[PDB]
Symmetry: D2
Subunit: 144 residues, 4 copies
Amino acid sequence: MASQTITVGPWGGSGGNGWDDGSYTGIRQIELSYKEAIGSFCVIYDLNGESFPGPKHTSKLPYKNVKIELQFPEEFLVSVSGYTATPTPVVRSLTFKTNKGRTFGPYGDEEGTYFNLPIENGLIVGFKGRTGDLLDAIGVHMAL
Amino acid sequence: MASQTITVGPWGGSGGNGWDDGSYTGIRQIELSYKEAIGSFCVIYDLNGESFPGPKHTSKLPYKNVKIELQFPEEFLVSVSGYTGPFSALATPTPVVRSLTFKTNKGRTFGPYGDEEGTYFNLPIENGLIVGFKGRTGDLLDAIGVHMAL
Amino acid sequence: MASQTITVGPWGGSGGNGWDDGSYTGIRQIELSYKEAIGSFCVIYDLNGESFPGPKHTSKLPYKNVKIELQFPEEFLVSVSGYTGPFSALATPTPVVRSLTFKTNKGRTFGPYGDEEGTYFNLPIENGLIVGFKGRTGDLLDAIGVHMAL
Amino acid sequence: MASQTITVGPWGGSGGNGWDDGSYTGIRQIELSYKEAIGSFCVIYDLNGESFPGPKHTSKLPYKNVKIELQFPEEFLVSVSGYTGPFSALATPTPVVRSLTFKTNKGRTFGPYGDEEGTYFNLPIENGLIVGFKGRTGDLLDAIGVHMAL
Ligand SMILES: [Cl-]
Ligand SMILES: [Cl-]
Ligand SMILES: [Cl-]
Ligand SMILES: [Cl-]
Ligand SMILES: [Cl-]
Ligand SMILES: [Cl-]
């Protein structure tokens, strides 16, 4: 009231429109749109054993849709990696890896800088970012 | 993959059925019913700036209903106190939540609700926040506990 | 800056002088002295796998000394309970820690040490660890509280 | 009772001997050596308001030594960044920490130290604190990771 979490990032540029999904109990699924860059980014979180759709950050862009369906609570994200009209940095590519050894991605275009967040202990419990159009910047909330 | 929180309590007895609302961003409202003990207990949580109603832990008992509306996020609980002990109207012979009192950082006292008999319990919080309630409910609130986060 | 933890309590009075050991990795040992109240109270903490004696909060009252040696990391506290109230030997009628009891996840009970008189307090821990103690000491233990972490 | 923290990383390779300082209250000072890669890496932590030197991870290499003195508690790290990659001076193409840069909430930049060659890595902290370091050291700093807390 209001509880807080460890927040890392963002990786990308000053948008665009800033958004913060806040924090939850975990992640059950993630949905993205990809081609040149990452367009749409949405999350279906876990909230105390139930699914909870996070606010939509959709891009209208004609990009391919992907669905990352984790075996929650047995399977979780151990890493978020990727690449970062306007010369402002945007999210070009995203990769996600799990504790069970499954690699989802790379999606988009691996160009420009590069970012990597390996997680040894803890969990991603929420996403933060900037969506114009497309995904400009992305960040994570962490908790034990 | 399920995030966890510090969990303290429960205060009360092993009767009824165990429930756990889980954890959220904070507390907006507490609704309870009382008479000589605590009946119903339901919470409206904050979940990332929006109201999120927790599961209801309703009692069919003809008790008086009360709404504890906190001025979230400026105002939050700094203590949860009360009394637990057997209740003579029975048929449960194990302790039950007889009374509850909530105090905030703004200096507001809510309660006592119920009947102040049995063993007193007090959780003063010096640093951190209640983010969820856990308990046991039968015909009454048998036990109560809390999740804490920073 | 300075990292923080969840802090609960204190239980007891406002007498003596306030102290806070701060927070560490866990608890290895608790040393206390008792008779009709709690006198001395010192802790040997874990700090990243090494022992770290915290500050001493010694009483010069000839009480019985006891060493609570916890089998760290397998063994940890699941509850701190006790009694607070004024003590016959004045010149202050402020409530003091009259008794303490410690229970572990391995079903070990340490105490009650002291005199089980006044107001009982109980902190059952369902999820999390005590990582530090805070309190107040004058001639004896006036108040006690804990830091908790995951 | 072993308390845990969020641990991110490591960044770098599998060479050297793995180490973990564990977690503390905060960071007071960072001592490192550098030339074409990072050599030595030693931290002075804060432990409940007092300085606590962690274990040394000293490189035998004739490198340039530097002290990053942080104005704890008001000044703390908001960023750790650098470069990771193979080093031509080595018999193995195992990636090592080539460069390090540290940024504080007070707008102070420390570095870049070393060679800005290989794979760039960046850890911005929007909320929370670095409370400990973990890594791998042989002749050089092969890997680096961080413990985080609120
Ligand atoms: Cl291309
Ligand atoms: Cl390419
Ligand atoms: Cl007496
Ligand atoms: Cl007696
Ligand atoms: Cl007696
Ligand atoms: Cl007596």
